Write a protein that binds this ligand. Sequence first.
Ligand SMILES: [Zn+2]
Lengths: 199, 382, 70, 503
Amino acid sequence: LPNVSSQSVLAFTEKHYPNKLKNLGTLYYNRFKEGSFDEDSTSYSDRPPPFLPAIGIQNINNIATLKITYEDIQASFNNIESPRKRNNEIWGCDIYSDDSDPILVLRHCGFKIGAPSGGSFHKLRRTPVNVTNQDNVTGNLPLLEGTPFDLEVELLFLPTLQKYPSVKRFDITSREWGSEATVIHDGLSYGIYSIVIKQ
Amino acid sequence: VYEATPFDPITVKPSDKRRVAYFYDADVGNYAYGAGHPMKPHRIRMAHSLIMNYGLYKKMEIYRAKPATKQEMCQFHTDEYIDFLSRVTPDNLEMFKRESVKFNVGDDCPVFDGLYEYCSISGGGSMEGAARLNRGKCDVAVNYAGGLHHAKKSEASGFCYLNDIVLGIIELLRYHPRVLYIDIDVHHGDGVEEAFYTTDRVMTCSFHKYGEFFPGTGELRDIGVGAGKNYAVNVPLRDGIDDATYRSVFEPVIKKIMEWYQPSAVVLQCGGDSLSGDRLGCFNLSMEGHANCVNYVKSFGIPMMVVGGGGYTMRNVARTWCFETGLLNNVVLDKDLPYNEYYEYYGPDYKLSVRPSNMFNVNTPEYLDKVMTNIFANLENT
Amino acid sequence: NESNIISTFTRRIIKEKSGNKLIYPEATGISSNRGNKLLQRSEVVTRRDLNNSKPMIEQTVFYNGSEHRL
Amino acid sequence: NISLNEEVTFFEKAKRYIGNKHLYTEFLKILNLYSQDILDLDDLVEKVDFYLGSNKELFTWFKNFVGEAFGPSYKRLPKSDTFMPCSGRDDMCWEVLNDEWVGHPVHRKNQYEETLFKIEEERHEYDFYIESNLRTIQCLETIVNKIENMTENEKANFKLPPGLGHTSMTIYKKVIRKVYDKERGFEIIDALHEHPAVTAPVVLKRLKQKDEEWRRAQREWNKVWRELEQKVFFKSLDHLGLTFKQADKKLLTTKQLISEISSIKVDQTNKKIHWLTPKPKSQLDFDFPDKNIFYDILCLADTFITHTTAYSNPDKERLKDLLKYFISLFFSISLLDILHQGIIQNRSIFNLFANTNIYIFFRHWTTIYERLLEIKQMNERVTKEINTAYKQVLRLSRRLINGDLEHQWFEESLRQAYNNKAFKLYTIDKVTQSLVKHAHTLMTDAKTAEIMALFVKDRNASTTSAKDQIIYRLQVRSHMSNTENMFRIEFDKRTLHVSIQYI
Ligand SMILES: [Zn+2]
């Protein structure tokens, strides 16, 4: 059981970024196209980039509301027609780089479709960056499987992390970054801040 | 306003035949950056050998600039940084690790033999070129040993330790009212641009690839600050620009600014990494396209200094520098390579011309039109 | 199905020692390191530094007791 | 063989420790599965923890055996950070320079370009080694010629301080360590510094010999370097000419074509990112405006059937007419004819429902076609520009499949005709052979034969009904496995447009 507590990053952000939290805006999940802040047109055909966009240093420690559709969650869960899932575009451990896929990140946090598991599950850390509520998962999931419920995801952007370890949690083997042979990552980092279930 | 203009063959302007002072030193080519390093001063020796074997020495006066001293370097740099640079050696870096992490030396600015001598010789080359251009003894100073613009006041980045360009600019400003700076390097001239934001005397134009690239600075909104407002223009571009596109995006801007700014002196960087087949570049220019900018700038009859930076594939930068040196004398080149020491390194055809690549150009005409629209709008203020 | 399988396992496990489905393409000529971590190598390039020739640095194979820069 | 019997003994000990025949077979299956590069090392060790975890020593053997701001990009420095003294600054340098504002930060190369970069780097490394050897030889020669004139008494106490009278004390150390081995380099340098009289002549002789040997080696390697450059530099100009070649190599796989339609569906129509308009019925739009692009392609096909190595004459005579049959049936161009409120009268829109085989054949047809429809709008332009062509490209493409023309000249023939307008006509042979092979696999299969018979029966009716389409779907699904992905093709005669949709 790989456990990384990782409270240094949040305390560091708290001391060195005393700016008030702000909701940048709603983000709509995409499967093949780089994300954007608009909804008028989301088509692009030319003859898989990371979904999250460049946020920049000035937008550290801010909340970006992300909306995820149920069909994409289905398609990613069993690995059917999903370039990011087949590529394992996941990097981090309870704190993930900007290139990590949001669906794989949420799965890595303990999220699971359907009713909660009936076993002796430990204290879930689905929202590790939210120290106030490390299991801030509000709303009731549909009891019947296959019911399309949309997920509202709040992501807290965090400064760059020195190293992204590789672990096998929830049958996901994330890739390793930040080792001695590799180089310091340039993009920012983010985690699951708040989760609200919407029907 | 951007309009499409097809590229045309370069012909010299016999109106002027100004004196050319090609500064050079034989000890610069000895220094090395590493084993797998892309930046090699050996390309300067390659270009000089090509010039020598080509028969171009009868027109230009070759010099050997005296290395600059610490006091001269202190005109722009800080005493602490230059002291660390002089003191640091490839052996005592462990005792200097504090400055190395503080001054950002070691990752992209490796410490090698005679590093301070390299910086001193480049600074002296730029200084002596500016001195010749200021006393009226010459009108073109080909300081191919310089071309170091990424260096900052207290930092060294991008294989750039000493900012000789700003030192030469200050020397020009000793007696000139206004000076102007041009760039052709694919990267951005962060140090040179930053050196004169708040003042009107110097202008810093850079034709730099923008986005996720090395400098990451120099957007279209870098208008200036304080009294130096509207006096630092930028022309960010994208991957895959070609000769005609570069000419169309280059010439009108220069014409407009020299109509407005009215420079009294000119310096032109000649970065050779913006060519086809380059190692660290993302352009598709050819030697004709590269020489187009220097020929165009020279055609305006103003005191100009050509410096040499960039270039990470030997053949491309060597041929481009030779072509620029020839065209600075209003002489078209033979475009056939004479046998020399490095004849084996010049391709499988041994021809001076290098064919530009077929890769897909990305610059849309409307984006360029909007870019020059903002450029002209902000330049019209003064 | 046993002796052959153990011989094959031993061969395939000793081949990796003492130095050496989509396979992904090598990343040469990119200065972003934002979404290209997926590509082959590309762990040595970043936006911070200028050098990007590291991915195509030749690798070595020890044959007949000596390395060879392939 | 030296490091194999130990592993054999270790595995024998593991088998004996397991003791169970069936568990041993399961472990054999596990290691065979790993031998096919399907099981990760972490998964392998976690699995072997279940079996050999009881024996700590054998488990350890296995584990160690398998391994204020102004501007967008500029920030104002604080008052305390503005003091970095510089003694060389005069009044003008103070007035006209800035010390309060500091800027802050906010394509795949071709494989042959990489090869050229590697070749250039190797050549420069050899050149640097030779130049350093020359400098060290010169330094040692001047040292030897200075010491030879010196007397014996000074020779005995002669000590060489580090540097060797050189502009760089580290220049000669690398050369010495390269000429010798890394373990003896420090010893040789120390001996030179302490006993120059006996060390300088012999080391100079070694350098003199190694210079000749290295120059001969460089001139020997230059043969291969010249041949590599000659055979690779010409190829290293077409960035689009090779990237699109590998894209065409990787594109026409069975999974990829259905992946395109499934992706566009799930991205635009199924997801409904706008969440304001109903999803469109179809996915892709295609057009067939010209019919003269049919006879030439049919001739290409007949050339391939008359040139193919593996095909029988009774099969070839069938293939020579099957293509004519599909073109006549689909595009209405020229049982015996076949071998050669929802009721709408005189229908012009027709539907074709089939399996992956017909879909792949149709996609091959359309991928070949849009390569030729793009040059339609540029044929006259390039004909104008060349003298400042359809028959020429046709006859040039004729000679490849029949073997008259080698593969190489095809690529360079179109280069002068189109500098950058055409970069998709370089792999016509591969797509044509894929299409003919897929037509053969269409005809051979019995299930595909039943599907084509159902399509024939549906098309032979000039009037359709609401229930007739459902009956056709049920009949095509009767012999069709449920797990197979369902597609549908609709062809519009009014606009000569063929549309497709993923079910
Ligand atoms: Zn550059």
